[PDB]
Design an enzyme around this catalytic site. Structure first.
Site, mmCIF file in Angstrom:
data_model
loop_
_atom_site.group_PDB
_atom_site.id
_atom_site.type_symbol
_atom_site.label_atom_id
_atom_site.label_comp_id
_atom_site.label_asym_id
_atom_site.label_seq_id
_atom_site.Cartn_x
_atom_site.Cartn_y
_atom_site.Cartn_z
ATOM 1 N N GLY B 176 0.294 -6.682 -1.683
ATOM 2 C CA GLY B 176 -0.172 -7.981 -2.104
ATOM 3 C C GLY B 176 0.253 -8.269 -3.529
ATOM 4 O O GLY B 176 -0.414 -9.024 -4.239
ATOM 5 N N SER B 239 1.853 -11.115 4.768
ATOM 6 C CA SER B 239 2.978 -11.427 5.634
ATOM 7 C C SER B 239 3.209 -10.239 6.573
ATOM 8 O O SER B 239 3.586 -9.150 6.120
ATOM 9 C CB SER B 239 4.218 -11.754 4.769
#
Lengths: 49, 733, 49, 49
Positions: B176, B239
């Protein structure tokens, strides 16, 4: 004519991919054969023991 | 202005630094850097030296006896809170540590260290991507262009268009470290400067004033983030895939197209997430935003908490909705050029995967051949595909079992069926996102311009948790190689480029190398490991895998961290590799089935005979996606590549690795080294324990020692000679 | 618009086409068809078809 | 775009052609160790007998 260089480079490419197509089958055939030859070896030694 | 040039506002750092005399009487001359727990490295004074031992106190005044070689020499604040890092002299550790911690915390994330910048991911939506910022910057003369990602991309666009060589843009990070969010700003420079964006209305706030290619290439990123992103324990917007953007440029200046590849997708999480993670974003949007009509035709429950492939519960994302974000993205399809059918069609193939796991198999012990207690659960799948209902609910439990080459019917036992149904979901999602990224690229393929590029290695991962499987390993397997390309590009290919350009440079290195652990060339990568040469044989296991790693690397290869005993007798099997950012625990028990992928033949073959167009396309050879069983001769696939079994994806991720890496070392790299300040997902919080590991480990101290004299601006000699010429009307005539 | 007990949804659809639940027998997962019944359903569509 | 696709293919023609050679080295692994294995099958069978 510019496209004819693209034509030939692509014909060629496809024939190296198809040469490698041979090599796919050839390679995996040789790998499968290895594993049988292993099974011929390992045990035949073990049968000596 | 005092060795530094002239300032601007919050975008720059505080660069009209003083020279406030107080600092100066300390340069005399026996101060040092010492290890503390609280800050990290701190200031110490040599009071008395006992030969090879030293009595050095500290800022805290605690008199301590030390052994010589720890004493890092003091490097004074001539280099406190400059834009670029370069000028700092005594590059032993403390000197870099101090300096970055108090950069982030002083609002500046992205800091220059030559071309390859340092960025400490803020986790916030900062109002610095305004068109004010991106209107001044129309090919600007870089002082007004200070340490943000627009300049980095300006400097890429400004070398490249002239010097004609292909380029890369590579941001590394850990879990992240907002990768995607950064690349959107690489693209947000490109989408608002070099292209045909009609700017003379002067709007600093909301622009939205053409080009349409710019408005389209942007929208493909939310579209990609709704589908492919989900959540993790660390990361809200995770993602669950890894992409590569090839930013294309034509003959004259402005944009030409964009080719996004995609590497992996986390289809395994679809059955049940683990702890606080969320399901694939697109799903929740479709649930909350949908209206009374659509709700029927798509077969949504009115009530929530029904949706059986959403584990733990409905978890939120901090500070966003699910419901209005649907209406954003649906219209981002409209804006791309989707049709009034195909709108409903992508959602039709998406929501069945939310449905399916509703299918409740139950134990009927006379045989154990369970069949599932309903229809609703199956029909809300069946209709949205428009597959033959009479096939599905028979043939899933009773398929035409190919025996060698003849055919015998079988009823299946309870758990095989539950598992194959969960398999049916992971089959649908994997195939569709791969269908989708190409069908996105198709709208944005370089339509009669030119495929000249920048490749962005936007692989989203290197995300550390107790559960790391194979999944994590194949993502982590590039990210590793990326830190290897850092070494290969910060020492090596940076200056190898200076060498090709024949500049005034000196080749100097230090010595950081992963290649004594991790495999880089496609065939080393297609020797790694006890997985392609052996996935086909009934006796191999994730236990023998660990044992053949333990035969084939251990003792003699010093980089492989071994397990802390979950291996003697009873294994889950764990091991670790010495990857820069962190020694990571992996688990091996399972991998085999994640590298074979076992479903039901007869049903997905009958799904090939499906309807609804898009639902159909997702199935066959001719391009190469499914056609998924029967027998391609005995290779391991597939179609391309290889023969039959369902999958074998690790070998297909050889096939694209060759083509990508070949390009990457040819195409000159731009880099951004994004680091994380805290564990707790929080905005603004920086931690010193983490930062002390991380700034040692990202190649940073070494990566200032060269790249300090390394050049962040790079353009062309003919223009620059010709744009200047008569400035010296005294000297050159 | 109102899908709930799939058993109850199906009784309604098949009740509109007027078949009592003893020519087609229900159980839990599956429906049993007596002679004609499935291929009367096929015929009913295939009258207009 | 075609003046570029000339060089584009040529680049990829390096890509698949090294991929032929390296995979043929892994096929040479088979072609070589085959002889040793056959030698091992010879020395095995002859001694157990």
């Amino acid at each position: 004519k510019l496209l004819q260089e693209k034509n030939d480079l692509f014909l060629q490419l496809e024939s190296e991919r198809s040469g490698a197509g041979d090599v796919e089958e050839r390679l995996t055939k040789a790998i499968s054969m290895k594993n049988d030859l292993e099974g011929q070896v390992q045990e035949l030694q073990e049968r000596l023991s | 202005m005092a060795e530094d040039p002239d300032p601007t506002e919050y975008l720059y750092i505080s660069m009209e630094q003083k020279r406030k005399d107080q600092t100066k009487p300390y340069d005399g001359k026996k101060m040092v850097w010492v290890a503390d727990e609280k800050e990290g490295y701190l200031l110490g004074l040599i009071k008395s030296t006992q030969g090879d031992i030293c009595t050095v106190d500290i800022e805290g005044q605690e008199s301590r006896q030390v052994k010589k070689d720890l004493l890092q020499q003091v490097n004074p604040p001539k280099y406190e809170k400059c834009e670029d890092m370069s000028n700092l002299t005594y590059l032993n550790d403390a000197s870099v540590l101090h300096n970055l911690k108090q950069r982030y915390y002083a609002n500046l994330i992205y800091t220059y260290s030559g071309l390859f910048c340092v960025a400490i991911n803020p986790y916030k939506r900062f109002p610095i991507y305004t068109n004010r910022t991106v209107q001044i910057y129309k090919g600007r003369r870089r002082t007004e262009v200070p340490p943000h990602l627009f300049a980095i991309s300006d400097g890429a666009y400004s070398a490249m268009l002239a010097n004609r060589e292909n380029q890369s843009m590579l941001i590394t990070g850990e879990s992240g470290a907002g990768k995607t969010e950064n690349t959107k700003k690489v693209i947000a420079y490109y989408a608002n400067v070099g292209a045909a964006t009609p700017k003379p209305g002067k709007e600093a706030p909301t622009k939205e004033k053409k080009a349409t290619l710019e408005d389209q290439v942007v929208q493909t990123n939310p579209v990609l983030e709704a589908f492919g992103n989900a959540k993790t324990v660390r990361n809200d917007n995770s993602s669950r895939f890894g992409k590569f953007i090839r930013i294309h440029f034509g003959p004259m200046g402005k944009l030409a197209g964009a080719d996004i590849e995609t590497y992996l997708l986390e289809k395994a999480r679809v059955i049940s997430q683990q702890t606080l993670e969320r399901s694939y974003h697109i799903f929740y949007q479709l649930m909350s935003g949908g209206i009374e009509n659509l709700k029927a035709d798509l077969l949504l429950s009115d009530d929530i908490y029904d949706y059986h492939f959403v584990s733990q519960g409905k978890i939120e994302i901090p500070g966003v909705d699910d419901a209005e974000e649907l209406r954003l993205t649906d219209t981002a399809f409209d804006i791309l050029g989707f049709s009034h059918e195909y709108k409903t069609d992508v959602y039709k193939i998406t929501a069945s995967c939310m449905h399916l796991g509703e299918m409740k198999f139950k134990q009927r012990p006379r045989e154990e051949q369970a069949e599932a207690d309903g229809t609703e659960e199956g029909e809300r799948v069946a209709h949205l595909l428009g597959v033959n209902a009479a096939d599905l609910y028979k043939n899933l439990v009773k398929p035409k079992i190919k025996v060698g080459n003849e055919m015998v019917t079988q009823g299946r036992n309870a758990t095989q069926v539950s598992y194959s149904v969960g398999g049916l979901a992971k089959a649908m999602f994997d195939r569709t996102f791969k269908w989708l990224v190409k069908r996105l690229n198709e709208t944005l393929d370089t339509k009669q311009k030119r495929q000249y590029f920048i490749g962005v290695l936007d692989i989203a991962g290197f995300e550390i948790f107790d559960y790391n499987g194979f999944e994590q390993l194949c993502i982590n397997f590039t990210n590793e190689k990326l830190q290897q390309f850092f070494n290969h590009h910060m020492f090596v290919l940076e200056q190898e480029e200076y060498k090709r350009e024949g500049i005034d440079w000196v080749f100097i290195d230090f010595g950081l190398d992963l290649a004594a652990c991790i495999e880089l060339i496609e065939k080393p990568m297609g020797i790694l490991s006890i997985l392609e040469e052996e996935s086909m044989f009934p006796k191999a296991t994730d236990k023998s895998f660990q044992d053949k790693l333990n035969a084939n690397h251990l003792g003699k290869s010093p980089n492989f961290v071994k397990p802390k005993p979950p291996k003697p007798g009873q294994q889950e099997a764990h091991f670790s590799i010495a990857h820069y950012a962190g020694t990571v625990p992996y688990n091996i028990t399972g991998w085999l089935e994640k590298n074979k992928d076992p479903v039901n033949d007869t049903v997905v073959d009958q799904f090939k005979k499906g309807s609804n167009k898009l639902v159909q396309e997702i199935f066959e050879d001719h391009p190469g996606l499914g056609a998924e069983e029967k027998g391609g001769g005995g290779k391991g696939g597939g179609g391309r590549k290889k023969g039959a079994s369902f999958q074998t994806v690790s070998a297909l991720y050889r096939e694209q690795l060759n083509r990508l890496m070949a390009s990457l070392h040819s195409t000159q790299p731009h880099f951004v080294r994004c680091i994380i300040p805290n564990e707790l997902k929080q905005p603004g919080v920086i931690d010193s324990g983490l930062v002390m590991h991380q700034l040692t480990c990202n190649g940073v101290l070494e990566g200032i020692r060269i790249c300090r004299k390394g050049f962040p601006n790079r353009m062309v000699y003919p223009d620059f000679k010709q744009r200047y010429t008569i400035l010296a009307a005294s000297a050159v005539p | 618009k109102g899908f709930v007990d799939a058993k109850k949804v199906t009784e309604a659809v098949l009740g509109a086409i007027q078949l009592d639940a003893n020519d087609y027998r229900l159980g839990n997962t599956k429906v049993f068809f007596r002679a004609g019944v499935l291929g009367r359903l096929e015929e009913m569509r295939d009258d207009r078809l």
